[PDB]
């Protein structure tokens, strides 16, 4: 029953941690205010507001309710632990154990939802590691990072695959792309996007000076490549008319030239290469399709540009961890969690950082 | 022009009416001016007890 006791001890701690991350009191307050708003009969006159408020309420309630359940269940288990120990009633002990297990499961579920609330969190990812401005040292650092990541991925049970590797001319790697397949792979790794700070005495420097080299990790999920949808003839205007210059009697009469127009967007494609109108239309159709594709691409790019611009805005805040090897201390800048086991971290003990980051929601 | 903002932390943002005083920053390329802390839209530096004149910090009354 010592392991059971240990588990019990752990569970309270993690509950407390969860509460801290959540900011539980504030949540409770919010739930209360929302509840108060709800019972006021005037709030259901405005329908859009009211449904939103209801939506807000329920999740908050769940969060709160689960939390104290956890508080209570643990206490109950502790109470029954004594009975298990001294009185030596086995059935009761078993029941207590079962209860604890249930509680643990519930806790896990709550933590799970807190963690993997994003859309693409369940999916697999491409981890992209790029070496910095340093040179050989930077490349080495990047390589080290890559190694660490691989070790981490192997640890939890993910399938790693080196898609592209640009090798460093002296030592290490210039860049690497790693496909990481598995259950909730992106959700587990998405926090690691950012610049990593190595601080160590360079073995590649002849002077042997202490260098501060940087290398970026970039985790992005494998999005499903959507099929490029067939445009409807309802959305299309097809004009037919005579050609420019033309050249003959049959050309003056015949309307071979085709103008296809997209009604929702306002794009036009003209074609008058062929004698046959049908052929022209086909060619024009193709052109239109191509244009649509291009437009889609452009829109995608623009949105993407906005996103990074926003990311750029953070600037120095993209620096997520500091790996000091001289003083022997790793610090996550985002959370504030510190460890002196640098070598262990390098080997692949990232769970301590990653989990905390997930809990934070950054 | 471009002007340096001295002291730890500032309230400044876009469309903020400020007073600049001159004095070039050696490190920064093209910076020839200092903003005046404690004049116009610009606030004084928080929690300073020394060299307050330079940073627009009022006397801590006790």
């Amino acid at each position: 029953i010592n392991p059971v006791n240990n588990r019990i001890q752990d569970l309270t701690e993690r509950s407390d941690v969860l509460r801290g991350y959540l900011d539980y009191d504030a949540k409770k307050e919010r739930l209360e205010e929302v509840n108060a708003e709800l019972e006021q009969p005037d709030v259901w006159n405005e329908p859009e507001r009211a449904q939103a408020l209801g939506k807000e309420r329920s999740s908050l309630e769940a969060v709160v309710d689960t939390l104290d359940q956890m508080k209570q269940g643990l206490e109950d288990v502790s109470g029954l632990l004594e009975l298990a120990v001294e009185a030596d009633d086995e059935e009761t002990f078993n029941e207590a154990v079962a209860e604890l297990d249930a509680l643990e499961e519930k806790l896990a579920q709550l933590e799970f939802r807190r963690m993997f609330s994003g859309e693409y969190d369940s999916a697999d990812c491409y981890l992209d590691i790029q070496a910095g401005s340093g040179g050989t040292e930077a490349q080495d650092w990047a390589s080290m990072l890559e190694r660490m990541y691989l070790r981490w991925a192997e640890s939890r049970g993910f399938k790693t695959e080196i898609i592209e590797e640009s090798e460093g001319e002296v030592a290490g790697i210039k860049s690497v792309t790693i496909k990481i397949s598995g259950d909730y792979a992106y959700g587990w790794l998405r926090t690691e996007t950012g610049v990593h700070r190595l601080v160590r005495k360079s073995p590649f420097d002849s002077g042997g000076r202490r260098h501060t080299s940087f290398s970026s990790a970039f985790v992005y999920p494998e999005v499903d490549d959507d099929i490029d949808i067939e445009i409807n003839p309802a959305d299309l205007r097809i004009d037919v008319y005579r050609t420019s210059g033309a050249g003959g009697q049959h050309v003056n009469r015949t309307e071979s030239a085709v103008r296809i127009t997209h009604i929702p967007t306002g794009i036009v494609t003209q074609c008058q290469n062929d004698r046959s109108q049908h052929k022209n239309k086909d060619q024009a159709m193709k052109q239109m399709k191509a244009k649509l594709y291009e437009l889609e691409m452009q829109k995608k790019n623009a949105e993407k540009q906005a996103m990074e611009d926003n990311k750029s805005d953070i600037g120095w805040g993209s620096q997520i961890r500091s790996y000091v090897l001289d003083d022997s201390r790793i610090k996550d800048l985002r959370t504030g969690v510190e460890t002196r086991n640098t070598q262990a971290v390098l080997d692949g003990s990232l769970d301590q950082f990653i989990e905390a980051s997930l809990k934070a929601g950054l | 022009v471009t002007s340096y903002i001295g002291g730890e932390g500032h309230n400044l943002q876009e469309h903020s009416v400020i007073l600049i005083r001159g004095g070039r920053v050696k490190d920064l390329p093209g910076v020839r001016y200092h903003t005046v802390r404690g004049a116009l839209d610009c606030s004084g530096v928080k929690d300073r007890k020394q060299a307050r004149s330079k940073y627009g910090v009022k006397r801590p009354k006790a």
């Binding site: 910095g132 610049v195 002077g207 000076r209 080299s213 940087f214 970039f218 805005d313 600037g315 993209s318 | -």
Partner: protein
Amino acid sequence: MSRYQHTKGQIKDNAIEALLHDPLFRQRVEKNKKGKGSYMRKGKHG
């Protein structure tokens, strides 16, 4: 807080990578106190 004005212009693909290839995330090399680039003409307090 204040925005960092990066020297990359209009970022198109990835922001983090761009930042890494910027003066912001340049390498910081320590000046030796003893060894190679170690000679000081005048001391800190001399």
